[PDB]
Curated annotation (Swiss-Prot), chain D:
It is found in: Virion. Forms the portal vertex of the capsid. This portal plays critical roles in head assembly, genome packaging, neck/tail attachment, and genome ejection. Procapsid assembly may initiate with a nucleation complex composed of portal and scaffolding proteins. The portal protein multimerizes as a single ring-shaped homododecamer arranged around a central channel. Switches upon genome packaging from an asymmetrical conformation in the procapsid (PC-portal) to a symmetrical ring in the mature capsid (MV-portal). This change of conformation may serve as a signal for headful packaging. The chain holds residues 154 to 204 of 725 of the full protein. The gene is 1. This is Portal protein. Belongs to the p22likevirus portal protein family. Homododecamer. Interacts with the terminase large subunit; this interaction allows the packaging of viral DNA. Interacts (via C-terminus) with the head-to-tail adapter protein gp4; this interaction participates in the head completion. Interacts with the scaffolding protein; this interaction initiates procapsid assembly, thereby ensuring incorporation of only one portal ring per capsid. Interacts with the capsid protein. It comes from Salmonella phage P22 (Bacteriophage P22).
Length: 585, 51, 51, 51
């Protein structure tokens, strides 16, 4: 029964059915509308209450505080000026931004329900492949609410191992559109699963829409390649450890191989994982590396239980009980026949003419005689009901207000220094580090700085390979020096698709500092508050000229890039990343 | 040929790129541009707001 | 960096004061929630001769 | 939880046994790349200090 392995890992996710599904049941109920479903002898009017959400939506304003506007962590001798399209990922500007505004609702599922994931337009996008410079940003995943959450690891991700095992998207009769960009097969299996319920099931959902796709499972791309075993090369070895030391010297001058890495691999495949259903066909995804977008929330656990319990942990009994007090005040007028003191109304039921609420001067007849009694007053003044124990409740409310307020306390700050940086906003930058990796991870086709004549790259250099007399630009004239005049203008060595560890590209990644970090920007922000930390004196007259520009490219500033300081140059200038101008020199 | 056009969402702070942003922070007053002789370059020219 | 007593020892938390530090707030919970079911119908009764 | 180790605990260099107490526990999904160690009988039928 090992022919199915991950399936009983679905039935390992059956551990969250009888335990943690109640947890997310309440996680939806405690933070939204009703809580306790026991339903015994319940009061009449209900259903507008809430008074839940606001407390978090103010706090999550802090979430909004971390744009940081990152750049590439500037380098020393690397001036990617005309390197252009490569690292201009951040010049994506207004090109396409799109779905970002949904991240606000992406703040809700991290507390309320099971945390979801983020969609991507599937791998290579089919919308206008016009040159390079094409991308879109931050599309979420549907639902991921009440049905199933992960049993995989739930630690933190190094994971050259198998990662992001599942994609399931749709709910509808209309849901046939999502996979329509693939061959879109019609109406085969339709299994019956994913049945949340209290087993009473008064309502009706037989609805399913569940599909399970993962392209290559346990694809196990590794090295695990040995040879040169001592005697006869016994088969079925499968050397099990990545470390290599003690084999550093064995055979002295014995043998040589002379072959590169050519990997002929037999593939052991068990199933495309699902019990009775095998559908997905003929197309598989991605490659060695892992662009995969979906990210992690913040939850703790030790045993099977995994809970980060919300900020709603508090108000509970300060809510339902005020809903219950409608029995001890509003419901007595329903119990009592509305306040009818009667002391000797001999006429029994209220007559039409005497009491309609009409104004009557006499209210005539009262006669105080009775059967054999004796003469002493019999007084109704015993009052039947009076309000009882208002004070206790009255103060109960204040105590409850304190208790529910208490959890608002983290990092209390007014202004100035000693800020409120805490986990949540620091740990979702690990969620927003995934951005730049989803973009710049690897680019196979165009990294080209100068057009290389791809894989034909010899270009023009051959003139310098001739034995006879060789020359260069001579005799001045109208044509002396123009950009790309023949010198070499070509790249030697090797640049190919997915070259991996060879340097020159991968060095560009995230910063993640405080609010404003250094392109140049750290220095000016350490002024802190007030002013006067800036040194003075005559030299900064002549040293203040250039680098104080935070404008970079404006509208009419490009006038001043070529001219710059000019006339008397014998003092020296920056001569910045473009030293294009040397003529009479 | 979706995606190539000059006008799309600039969403961000309300400041305006025509001689505001540098001085358009309200509560932060001045000081970011200290004194200099050669600043004629910026003084004698770039302060003119003609829209 | 903490104190010590013997060998290695039961862990001293800041929650050792918070165990019963909540104390008897909960006693005001004793008079309200489900215990009206313990009380049989606060009886407004007098001169009810209906047999 | 179930791991309490009394050995040294003081000098960050640890001129002592030079081995931290080693205990590893996960769920049955630990097939993973862990097949790159051991995997002969793959189960020694052990159990460790489960309360």
């Amino acid at each position: 029964e090992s022919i199915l392995s991950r399936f009983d890992a679905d039935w390992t996710a059956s551990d969250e059915a009888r335990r943690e599904a109640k947890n997310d049941l309440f996680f939806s109920r405690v933070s939204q509308w009703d809580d306790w479903l026991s339903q015994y002898t319940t009061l009449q009017y209900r259903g507008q209450f809430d008074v839940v959400r606001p407390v978090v939506r103010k706090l999550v304003s802090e979430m909004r505080q971390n744009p940081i506007d990152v750049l590439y962590r500037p380098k020393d001798g690397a001036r990617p000026d005309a390197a252009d399209v490569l690292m201009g990922m951040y010049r994506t500007d207004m090109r396409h931004n799109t779905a970002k505004i949904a991240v606000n609702i992406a703040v809700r599922e991290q507390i309320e329900a099971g945390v979801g994931a983020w969609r991507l337009v599937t791998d290579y996008e089919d919308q206008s492949p016009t040159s390079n410079n094409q991308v879109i940003r931050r599309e979420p995943i549907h639902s991921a609410c009440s049905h199933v959450i992960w049993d995989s690891n739930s630690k933190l991700m190094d994971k050259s191992d198998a990662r992001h095992c599942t994609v399931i998207h749709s709910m509808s009769q209309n849901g046939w559109e999502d996979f329509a960009e693939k061959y879109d097969l019609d109406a085969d299996d339709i299994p019956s699963f994913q049945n949340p319920n209290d087993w009473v099931f008064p309502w009706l959902t037989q609805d399913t829409i569940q599909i399970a796709e993962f392209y290559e499972v346990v694809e196990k791309k590794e090295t695990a390649f040995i040879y040169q075993d001592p005697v006869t090369g016994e088969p079925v070895s499968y050397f099990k450890r990545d470390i290599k030391d003690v084999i550093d010297d064995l055979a002295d001058s014995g043998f040589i191989k002379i072959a590169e890495r050519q990997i002929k691999r037999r593939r052991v495949y068990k199933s495309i994982i699902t019990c009775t259903a095998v559908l997905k066909d003929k197309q598989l995804i991605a490659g060695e590396h892992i662009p995969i977008v979906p990210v992690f929330g913040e939850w703790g656990f030790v045993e099977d239980k995994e809970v980060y319990e919300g900020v709603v942990r508090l108000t509970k009994d300060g809510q339902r009980l005020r809903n219950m007090i409608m029995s001890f005040n509003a419901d007595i007028v329903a119990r009592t026949p509305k306040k009818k003191p009667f002391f000797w109304p001999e006429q029994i039921a209220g007559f039409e003419h005497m009491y309609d609420g009409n104004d009557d001067y006499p209210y005539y007849l009262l006669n105080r005689t009775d059967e054999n009694s004796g003469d002493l007053p019999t007084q109704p003044l015993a009052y039947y009901e009076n309000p009882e124990v208002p004070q206790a409740n009255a103060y109960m409310l204040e105590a409850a207000t304190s208790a529910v307020k208490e959890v608002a306390t983290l990092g209390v700050d007014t202004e100035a220094v000693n800020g409120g940086q805490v986990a949540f906003d620091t740990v979702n930058q690990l969620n927003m580090r995934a951005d730049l990796e989803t973009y710049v991870f690897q680019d196979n086709l165009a990294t080209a700085m100068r057009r290389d004549g791809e894989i034909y790259q010899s270009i023009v250099n051959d003139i310098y390979d001739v034995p006879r007399n060789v020359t260069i630009t001579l005799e001045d004239g109208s044509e002396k020096d123009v950009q790309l005049m023949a010198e070499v203008v070509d790249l030697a060595t090797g640049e190919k698709q997915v070259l991996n560890d060879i340097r020159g590209r991968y060095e560009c990644y995230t910063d993640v500092g405080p609010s404003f970090q250094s392109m140049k920007q750290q220095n000016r922000a350490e002024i802190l508050e007030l002013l006067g930390k800036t040194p003075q004196g005559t030299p900064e007259y002549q040293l203040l000229l250039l680098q104080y520009f935070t404008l970079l490219d404006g509208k009419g500033v490009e006038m001043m890039r070529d001219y710059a300081n000019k006339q008397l140059i014998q003092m020296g200038v920056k001569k910045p990343e473009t030293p294009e101008e040397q003529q009479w020199l």
